[PDB]
Design an enzyme around this catalytic site. Structure first.
Site, PDB file in Angstrom:
ATOM      1  N   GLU A  47       0.888  -1.141   0.000  1.00 54.66           N
ATOM      2  CA  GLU A  47       0.000   0.000   0.000  1.00 54.66           C
ATOM      3  C   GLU A  47       0.930   1.195   0.000  1.00 54.66           C
ATOM      4  OE1 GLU A  47      -1.070   3.191   1.984  1.00 54.66           O
ATOM      5  OE2 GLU A  47      -1.931   1.849   3.531  1.00 54.66           O
ATOM      6  N   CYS A  74      -2.041   8.028   4.701  1.00 50.27           N
ATOM      7  CA  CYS A  74      -2.110   7.766   3.272  1.00 50.27           C
ATOM      8  C   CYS A  74      -3.505   8.095   2.756  1.00 50.27           C
ATOM      9  CB  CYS A  74      -1.751   6.312   2.956  1.00 50.27           C
ATOM     10  SG  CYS A  74      -0.002   5.907   3.183  1.00 50.27           S
TER      11      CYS A  74
END
Ligand SMILES: Cc1cc2c(cc1C)N(C[C@H](O)[C@H](O)[C@H](O)COP(=O)(O)OP(=O)(O)OC[C@H]1O[C@@H](n3cnc4c(N)ncnc43)[C@H](O)[C@@H]1O)c1[nH]c(=O)[nH]c(=O)c1N2
Lengths: 980, 979
Positions: free
Chosen positions: B735, B769
């Site tokens: 990720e 994020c």
């Protein structure tokens, strides 16, 4: 007919009366076998353990194998049934005793002595020679020669035999009319490659040996019965009988078995009688119900064929009485042997024959030796004319025969079980089975999604059918009228021609050019990618159910062209008939299966259960998929990878292998016929050296599906991991690469099964399968025997053009393959020792000999490197632990097989033989969609499995949409909310 | 009991005097009665109509109005009979409906309408309508509106005769009540009201309430402190208590208590005891409660105990029970009965008579516009009725209307049952205690493998005193534990090295939390060797047994929840809530992946052909490198590591340097769980020394990475290489960044959009994020949205995360601060600064809360992930451009949209192609199972942590196929295709 039926029932009642409550030995609860069968019938798990134990028993030739298998099958002593190393002794003696119950002897001289005893007790015989499956010409000759030996011994004895007492006729003959010597032969035991795929060759080979036996039978005025085996060979065997009968049209003592459990049998019987009348010959039919019921049902289901047997037991009984009546009515031309242990059946025949006033010289009764003893004695008393089917020979096949007798006697539907174990009411036992059929047909009169039927694999080609046999030569000829075309690229719905042409030729006949293929340069590949990319937004936005509909239409289009598409593969890449058809059916399966999988996966699913909130989880495509396809499954794997990419919403740039570019064009034809929108599928064959890296490296590619060699796959993986300027995604790899697949042959393996499965796994389609067996790892104690049989079977096979169904395998894919493989064979012959190297045809063709090399060890190159050709390495393992260690000694882990009947060894293999697809007691090739999702890890792939329920997810990415549904203090209640 | 039966008879009889003596939404002749009737018949329609009324005041152009009408009600044929012309039809009717519940739009009109009501015999309590307070300027406007009202009222009241009574002061209402009575919503006085900063919220609200109260007292009036959502109940109680004691001799101050709260029996007991202790008097307005559906939903969403009763009769029973308690205490506690329920009113009336309560100790209140025949009848029967009368702007007037429509048409509404239904009076006037028992009795008529179904761990709950006290205490306890050296943990042994790196408090870098040993390549190699040696036995361990270790680790973490959170406050500058959520997510991964492995651990038969068994199942890969980020130091670390471990792999774990102690928590948790040696190895180290070594190692089969795109792409590229002796092609689970946008559509609810965007952008100072770094605002709502967003930003404070008064604090370390500041400067040259906060002087890695406008998709700060408190504001010309701009980056991780347009929401769901799209809420805070998290493009490889596809990525499938036929027989299996 109520009047006849009442006479039959009363006849049956008299019969049961005459028996005096006596039970056959198998149902004698005072005997060990009776106890064993009693418990088997009460407890299905024990039955399975006991019967499989008897099956493996003759391979337990050391004290250790025997002791271990007893523990593995039946547990420790304290946990066995009471009726059950001293244990080794008691088990061995009792099992051997059961087997001798059904066998007249182990040698010819013993058999003859015992048959003569049987005569003194009033019984006639038909003698059968026990034998393991015939796997070679030497084995066929040994079987043939045993009958000749038996006949020479009987020839010397029969003159000293007074004919069994009859009511009239010739006092030198049994009952006044029957020949004293009567033998039964199993036709497929006369030819190890008996297969309707090679129909004429099979008939001839069997006929030639049957003729030799028959001449000797005729020489002593004896009777020969041609027995009937499984449905696969039924038409072959009927043709063998017909031809032999016509060669000796004046010799009356030749019989054929027909099976009343076959739906075909009403027609087969009527045809045979009409045939006999037409040819002015007489025949003899032994009518049986049939010996392979469970086998036929399973085999048909496994191949999506119509089950050839009736599936309600009374239908077979009804069919028997019906067909027996037909035979009796035709007694002028047809002599009848009633072969049944069923008192209703026997009674029916007796009463019908009396009613039709059939001469007694036109019908006799037969039973299996050592079975239904009180029925046998009852037949003697009431009919007088009773013949025992008497097998003799080696105890190894003797145990297999025993297992079949135990299965027969203990079946739920067994007349003998119902009469002698279950105390069934006599009236039910003796009722007209036609009545039984209605009652059970009536009771019997008592799933897919989204309107679609559930998935089922497309039916395999079925060469028992004359129309399927005739279809291949016809469709191959049709293909030959279509040769010499130029195949262009297909981009954005249009044909694009280039000026770089490569011929595609017939590997079995390279002077035969099938066509010319245009090669895409980087320019055209770039155009194809641009077209796919432009088509992607609208295709991505197309409803998943609508996308699936295009695959369903493609499947229908392929189904309608099944033999045509297969014929192209026979010629373009040297597929055998069955191999070609299976390639096309697999393509169809992928289309049907992936369509359904996309429908399943296409509906967004709610995740979580919190109120005031809706989370929906769903999948989206990636973009443009490069599909780089192999030549060895040129329609199946191409269609599989392409349709998976397409149905999930990606658009495809497809590079078929050069030498199967015409098959690749079939995807163009199929997707066009289905009406697929332009740009979604683009066909760009090209030279790897020109456009290979370009296709893989291109920034607009988001996914690469590749099947082929490890070297190329690994290169692609490395290059694809780079993210170039303008590249939207990290590239997704879907990859299936090589295998160096082993089959383990354990000490207790059934070699009758292991040998042909290993041969097919190694040499089917010339060994050109990523799943092919290239290493056979054989346990020390069974090595010499396995190899002798494997090599002898290989010697009977022929190498030649795939369009000729008589050849087992043919030329390899192309000149480079042939050179590569031959080099590997030379390497292997210097590492190990050549066991077999077949002849090949003279003249043109990329032929590589069928090659078997022994003495191979894990450190050898041909024990490690994928050859992709007909070169089999044989490795001798000192024990099972080493076998497993050697199986796992390569860098690959694609498929594997094991033939073993040890629960402990199978368990160790399930756990430790860590291949993607492990097969137990069958070949390791031929994976089917859904049943065997295919693929592995290590250097064999990246853990993606085509034809399985995880596959489509690899072509997509998940998305979640989360909505806060509360506005101004209120939210709708949803069905699955955690609420109050 | 027998006495119970007698009093009930008097209540039931009083109920009928009300019915004998006896609204416009139930009148099927008026348009609203028709719209409401159809709402009560068709739930789909009710939802559309109420949501339409909610969005209605944002429909400021002919285009917005016309399109929303079509999207909510379909075409002029689809929509029902009581429904450009439609624009005119709806506007006038909806506006007319809203006016029924307010006494005016200006102070002058309100005061004039209140005087009319007085001459009609009605008292009033005046409330000021307003949108949510989102800034200090807004809180001041709300405050000054009350002062303006009071000043207006002050000049009028001397002219008013008191409502007629039975005696007393004829200048007072009924002889005793103050003529001027106002109600104030406490949270409207402070835009950051939050029990997380309990004291700060009390004081800020109290200071404004005191200003209003002084003016109230100047005219001898009454101030009622209204009660809002459960989140602020304790704050509001404390505001009331402090103000009361500041003016202990002034009797005209009231508090609202809500009978629907399970807490209320005790809150009322406590408040009464408190008043006796302090020898003061109080007034309580008892209501049932206005936020029922909201409290239930909010509690379920956070796995908290639902604070309200969930059987409606339980609230009625509570009301009668609590009204009796107040009335028993009439000497000290004045009572305002506030209900439109005739049973409830009649009960209060008969209890007051039973207890001989003097009339000056209780009155009756109803909302203006509602229950007219009750207000007609109560006036005639009860005599002392006060109308709750809101006034002000039509915009919040519409939201108030929605609530009234919701109340009036609820299935369980006493009003709906009384009229629209034609119910039996016997059932309506039934003792709700009897209804409770019947309904409780009716109600007196799932997991797997013996395990409870998965549920997310309860979030920290600062309504609780113990949760508020826990953080300071646990932060202190962590501070007694500083100064340790943390070793490698390899093969169950601590391994010390000579290379130490300090970890410090980013909000106070002079505070050193410990020293972390760094692994060289030799130690990394040893850990890989240990993992590899442990792998065969671990792989061969039953999936249910492997899952059991995760469950043990989860219990271990659950017992240390506040302690584990406190480390994160100090080591990485997590705010209290952010820290606790990091630990609960870690716990959630453990609970969820344990269940997922149990589900996936059983071999499944595939295919249905007889004589054959195919079993499909999964195998682990081998050694997994887990390379963890610092921003979710326990959650993501534990997620990636527990996933690899539970699936049968062994882990070599590299925590980020600056959160190495949090990394050590994994060692502690797995050790406490008794995980076999070598299955988890802890090797912090320098990337420049051992990063490539770890990734390149041939014994590595899998790499789980969460972090920057740059590092993630390098790892992917290097891992693709198969080295000599490498058994597998390396599997990547990754990720990487996001450049996440939230779109603010024209019809957005700005009361929601503004705080959610502020949180999405600046929560944990932008270091997620998933953080919002682009807010894309529609042209016509731009100026208004930005003013409110900037004004709310100005009210927040930047400072140390251990102080809960601060909104955000220092970024991760020196490097992050320098990088972020370079981006801020780049951004300020590209666009124009709208807001740049002050920051504390002295030490700490402080970056200002920064908002920059004029940003377009070509700009660097519209494209590059800054990972800090820098928000780009982009002005979109229409919705199509908003979507285009949202999609204009190389990332696709999260996204948000505030819109109440069905068409725009449908377009976003289809086209705003991020891994996690959020509608009408913040785009951060994904939860396990509910929001499986992750995306594609440059944001990842399409793996979603916390979802049902995730564990498969750590394994490979195998199939075993057995021919079960021997000698012509095969066992029949259950699911065989057979005859
Ligand atoms: C002299 C001699 C020679 C031979 C054979 C027998 C004898 C006596 N056999 C074996 C023969 O097929 C077998 O013994 C009989 O089927 C046994 O049936 P009965 O009439 O004895 O018993 P019973 O009346 O109990 O009938 C059992 C039979 O019913 C059939 N059946 C069982 N379940 C069924 C179901 N659910 N639906 C429909 N039908 C069902 C099967 O055929 C089964 O064998 C044979 N067989 C062969 O195939 N080829 C051969 O060459 C020979 N050779």
């Amino acid at each position: 007919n109520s009047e006849l039926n009442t006479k039959i029932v009363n006849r049956g009642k008299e019969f049961f009366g005459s028996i005096s409550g006596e039970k056959p030995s198998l149902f004698n609860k005072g005997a060990w076998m009776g106890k064993a069968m009693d418990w088997s019938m009460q407890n299905e798990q024990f039955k399975i353990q006991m019967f499989r134990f008897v099956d493996v028993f003759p391979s337990l030739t050391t004290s250790k194998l025997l002791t271990e298998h007893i523990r593995e099958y039946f547990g420790n002593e304290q946990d066995m049934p009471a009726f059950m190393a001293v244990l080794n002794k008691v088990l061995t003696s009792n099992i051997e005793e059961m087997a001798r119950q059904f066998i007249v002897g182990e040698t010819t001289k013993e058999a003859v002595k015992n048959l003569e005893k049987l005569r003194k007790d009033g019984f006639a015989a038909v003698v059968d020679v026990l034998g393991e499956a015939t796997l070679s010409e030497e084995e066929a000759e040994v079987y043939t020669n045993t009958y000749l030996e038996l006949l020479e011994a009987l020839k010397k004895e029969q003159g000293s035999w007074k004919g069994l007492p009859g009511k009239g006729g010739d006092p030198g003959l049994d009952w006044g009319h029957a020949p004293k010597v009567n033998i039964a032969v199993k036709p497929t035991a006369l030819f190890c490659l008996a297969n309707p795929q090679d129909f004429e060759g099979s008939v001839v080979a069997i006929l030639d040996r049957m003729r030799r036996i028959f001449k000797k039978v005729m020489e002593l005025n004896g009777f020969l019965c041609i027995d009937m085996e499984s449905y696969r060979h039924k038409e072959i065997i009927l043709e063998v009988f017909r031809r032999l009968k016509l060669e000796y049209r004046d010799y009356p003592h030749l019989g054929i078995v027909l099976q009343a459990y076959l739906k075909d049998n009403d027609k087969d019987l009527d045809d045979l009688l009409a045939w006999a009348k037409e040819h002015k010959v007489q025949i003899s039919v032994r009518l049986v119900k049939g010996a392979y019921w469970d086998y036929e049902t399973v085999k048909a289901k496994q191949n999506d064929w119509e089950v050839p047997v009736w599936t309600i037991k009374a239908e077979s009984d009804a069919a028997y009485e019906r067909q027996a009546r037909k035979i009796l009515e035709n007694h002028q031309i047809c002599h009848f042997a009633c072969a049944s242990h069923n008192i209703r059946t026997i009674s029916a025949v007796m009463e019908m024959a009396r009613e039709l006033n059939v001469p007694e010289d036109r019908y006799e009764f037969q039973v299996l030796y050592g079975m239904a003893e009180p029925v046998r004695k009852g037949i003697l008393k009431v009919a007088g004319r009773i013949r025992l089917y008497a097998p003799y020979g080696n105890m190894v096949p003797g145990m297999g025969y025993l297992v079949r007798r135990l299965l027969e006697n203990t079946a739920n539907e067994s007349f003998l079980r119902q009469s002698f174990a279950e105390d069934a009411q006599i009236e039910r036992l003796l009722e007209d089975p036609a009545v039984t059929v209605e009652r059970e047909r009536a009771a019997r009169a008592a799933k897919g999604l989204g309107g679609l039927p559930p998935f089922n694999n497309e039916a395999m080609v079925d060469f028992t059918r004359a129309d399927h046999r005739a279809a291949f030569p016809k469709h191959i000829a049709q293909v030959r009228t279509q040769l010499g075309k130029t195949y262009p690229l297909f981009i954005n719905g249009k044909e694009v021609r280039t000026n770089d042409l490569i011929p595609t030729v017939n590997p079995n006949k390279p002077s035969e050019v099938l066509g010319q293929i245009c090669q895409a340069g980087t320019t055209e590949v770039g155009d194809a990618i641009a077209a796919a990319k432009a088509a992607f937004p609208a295709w991505r936005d197309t409803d998943p159910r609508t996308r699936a509909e295009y695959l369903l239409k493609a499947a229908q289009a392929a189904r309608k062209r099944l033999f045509e598409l297969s014929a192209w593969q026979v010629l373009e890449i040297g597929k055998q008939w069955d191999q070609a058809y299976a390639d096309v059916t697999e393509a169809i399966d992928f289309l049907e299966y992936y369509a359904r999988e996309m429908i399943r996966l296409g509906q967004p699913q709610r995740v979580g259960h919190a109120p005031g909130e809706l989370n929906h989880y769903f999948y989206e495509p990636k973009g443009v998929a490069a599909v780089i396809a192999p030549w060895n499954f040129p329609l199946a794997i191409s269609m599989g990878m392409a349709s998976a990419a397409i149905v999930t919403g990606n658009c495809v740039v497809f590079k078929p292998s050069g030498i199967t570019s015409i098959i690749g064009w079939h995807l163009v034809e199929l997707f066009r016929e289905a009406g697929l929108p332009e740009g979604v599928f683009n066909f760009t064959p090209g030279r790897g050296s020109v456009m290979g890296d370009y296709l893989v490296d291109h920034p607009d590619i988001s996914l690469i599906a590749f099947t082929g060699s490890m070297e190329t796959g690994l290169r692609i993986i490395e290059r694809a991991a780079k993210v170039h300027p303008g590249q939207a995604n990290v590239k997704k790899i879907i990859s299936e690469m090589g295998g160096k697949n082993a089959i383990i042959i354990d000490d207790d393996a059934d070699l009758d099964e292991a040998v042909p499965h290993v041969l097919y796994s190694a040499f089917g389609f010339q060994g050109q399968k990523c799943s092919a067996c290239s290493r056979v790892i054989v346990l020390d104690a069974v090595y010499d025997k396995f190899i002798e049989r494997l090599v002898s079977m290989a010697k009977a096979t022929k190498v030649g053009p795939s369009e000729d169904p008589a050849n087992y395998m043919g030329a390899v894919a192309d000149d480079k393959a042939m050179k590569s493989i031959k080099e590997y064979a030379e390497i292997g012959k210097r590492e190990g020792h050549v066991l077999y190297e077949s002849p090949v045809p003279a003249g043109e063709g990329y032929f590589v000999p069928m090659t078997i090399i022994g003495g191979i060890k894990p450190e050898h190159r041909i024990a490690q490197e994928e050859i992709f050709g007909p070169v089999l390495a044989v490795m001798r393992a000192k024990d099972f632990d080493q076998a497993i260690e050697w199986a796992n000694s390569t860098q690959f882990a694609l498929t594997g097989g094991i033939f073993s009947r040890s629960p402990e060894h199978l368990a160790k293999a399930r756990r430790e033989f860590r291949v993607g697809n492990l097969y137990i007691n069958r070949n390791n090739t031929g994976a089917l969609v859904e049943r065997q999702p295919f693929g592995g890890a290590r250097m064999s792939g990246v853990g993606t499995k085509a034809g399985g329920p995880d596959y489509l997810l690899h072509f997509m990415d998940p998305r979640v949409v989360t909505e806060n549904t509360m506005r101004r203090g209120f939210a709708p209640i949803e069905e699955d909310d955690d609420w109050v």
